[PDB]
Symmetry: C2
Subunit: 412 residues, 2 copies
């Protein structure tokens, strides 16, 4: 067969076999061949299941129709995002935090902006991540050339600082043990652990980054599930404006898909070592990778940031939080150590003395419930399984009675 003489990107080659998302899809389909009649319940991926509130879809449909009229029509979009959306985001979520409308960069998605940020930072930065955390940070880092090879003895890529977050340290790293890196990806409430950093912890984090001359990329995607009295934004910490940016996903904030839209806030005081403002480079990257967020999505996002939209968001969030309580009580009554769930829509269940892939396989085999193995979120996730609260109420209740059948004889 013919082959080009183009070398495969050696950073693609670095990636380990059996990435979380394609692996779960494999096992789930293998499972359905095995049990063609199984009623499978998915509590894997943070994948939301309830209809978009009508207030938002009406706004989107209205914008849709308007795009077929003259005066109601508009061509492309402002590349940083429509000014009214950037304004509404700055005021609704960052009012009093010293954030201007022009510090907010709107994108078509949040996972999209991890990527754009990684292209911007480039191949020669080093990164720290929570261990465990969402696998996209690590993966984007490998792909950009920021890492060494995977080491299968420690299950880590070389040159990434994995900051261990455990029950014994209250799921916040011991910073006195963390090596300096250029970038610190920090997600609060964290996926998968559900842990939300306290004000005192985020103060330590900002002080650490200041001393090390690092940039924190703070992912507040799940901040709307906060129940404990903890900061929702890194910019609530004085000094964060010299060392941090913040990224969030509308879909995760609103508790529903359909508004395909994220943002990144980069403050004026965040500077590279030569004094150049980081925001100017991000803006420059948006002028090559982008044209604008979709105007129908923008119309929905704008509808969200109103009394009626905030009320619909709160209600949806409240529904998933009651789903989480059902799951917590199920595992707690079964005798397990259950973490998270308070400030996020998933629970992080400790299964000590089994590999998380084995637990995942056993739960799927025996109950037809899909969960997510902890080791999918890095080596610090080994020992745990994440269970998502995203599903119809009936499905959550049915999954929990199946857990109860499965695990009844495990504990006393």
């Amino acid at each position: 067969e013919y082959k080009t003489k183009v070398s495969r990107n050696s950073n693609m080659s670095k990636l380990q076999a059996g990435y979380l998302f394609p692996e779960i899809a494999r096992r789930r389909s293998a499972h359905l061949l095995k049990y063609p009649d199984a009623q499978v319940i998915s509590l894997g991926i943070g994948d939301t299941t309830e209809p978009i509130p009508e207030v938002i879809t009406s706004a989107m449909a209205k914008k849709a129709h308007e795009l077929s009229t003259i005066e109601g029509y508009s061509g492309y979009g402002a590349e940083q995002g429509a000014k009214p959306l950037r304004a509404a985001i700055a005021k609704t979520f960052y009012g009093g935090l010293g954030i201007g409308d022009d510090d907010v960069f709107v994108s078509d998605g949040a996972k999209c902006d991890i990527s754009r940020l990684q292209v911007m930072f480039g191949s020669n930065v080093t990164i720290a991540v929570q261990d465990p955390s969402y696998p996209a940070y690590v993966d984007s880092s490998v792909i950009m050339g920021q890492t060494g090879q995977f080491n299968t003895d420690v299950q880590k890529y070389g040159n990434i600082e994995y900051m261990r977050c455990t029950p014994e340290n209250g799921f916040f790293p011991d910073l006195s043990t963390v090596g300096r890196t250029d970038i610190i990806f920090f997600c609060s409430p964290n996926n998968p652990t559900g842990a939300a950093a306290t004000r005192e912890q985020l103060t330590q984090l900002v002080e650490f980054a200041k001393k090390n001359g690092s940039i924190i990329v703070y992912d507040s995607a799940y901040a709307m599930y906060m129940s404990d009295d903890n900061p929702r934004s890194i910019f609530e910490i004085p000094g964060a404006e010299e060392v941090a940016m913040e990224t969030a996903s509308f879909s995760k904030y609103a508790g529903f898909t359909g508004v395909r839209l994220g943002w990144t806030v980069i403050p004026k005081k965040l500077l590279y070592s030569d004094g150049f403002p980081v925001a100017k480079d991000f803006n420059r990257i948006i002028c090559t990778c982008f044209n604008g967020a979709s105007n129908i999505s923008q119309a929905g996002a704008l509808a969200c940031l109103t009394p009626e939209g905030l009320e619909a968001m709160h209600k949806v969030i409240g529904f998933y939080k009651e789903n989480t309580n059902i799951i917590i009580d199920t595992f707690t009554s079964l005798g397990y150590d259950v973490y998270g769930g308070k400030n996020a829509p998933y629970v992080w269940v400790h299964f000590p003395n089994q590999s998380s892939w084995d637990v995942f396989a056993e739960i799927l085999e025996k109950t037809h419930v899909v969960t997510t193995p902890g080791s999918g979120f890095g080596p610090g996730g080994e020992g745990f399984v994440r269970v998502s609260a995203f599903g119809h109420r009936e499905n959550i209740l049915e999954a929990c009675r199946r857990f109860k059948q499965l695990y009844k004889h495990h504990h006393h």
Copy 2:
């Protein structure tokens, strides 16, 4: 003031000041400060002006409504695009060309598709581009670290193969003069010249890529404007399946902004030097950045690929082609060499012995019309201006009468 210790990405430092889009933006804003009441007509950046046809927006609104119902509610897209959309694209645009549904990767957009491909290829490939061409190819290469610094004597980044396309060669390069690269970005119809490569020309391009062991990235964004009888897809050339992929933006194909949707076709027989299939790395990539193109955009796109949707598209395209002819006739009647306009919704006008930024500036100052300076499309663009045909008919007519009045005597 405090600064972090993080070194700026030297690939960002490489980029020249005054990138096309930011620059026009600065100049347009400054013009409105100077003249708040100016009736500005924009014939700059390819951005469409007419209402999206009702057949498409109705489908989008219907999908929006359904997402509020239990029975209609879906959310996360298939990461490579929903199968029904992939199948409709493959059949509608690639039927008979040996392209399967699984060869089509649907994304939210085409400008970022260039970006995603370039992350996939990585920092160690070399590229060739048409000169002039749409500046995102070069820009994406610089950003990914594929290049040297910008050289001001030649107005080029180091290590990019700029393939000279001129009136004198019909805007197709002399491939015997083109150095070998890993990647060849090739746009037909070309933005900004409007030139559509012939079957014989694309045959030469495939043979060249085959002997060089290169990958062609063929950008067919404007192929629905083709009037001459030229291939619309690189895959019409036998053997392209071994050396080429194709990329396109739904907005450019359909002739209307609103369906924020693109695709890339990567055939099974396109392999890296170690035998690994390029499509597999693309797939792995879109499963780290992306999640899917919106359910609503996919519904609009699905609606375009029907008899009624194709009819609406054809109508909108025909409108813009008439806009183009008005512009061509205007500049021709004024005695300028005018290129393009036949196979694409813009015209490429030669302004000899003058800088394209100065011509742009003069036209904007005197007529309040925004054009695009040719030098924004690389050094081969110097001495030309592109004028877009996207606008209401009355705006095109008004712009042309300003041009005629300015340039008559």
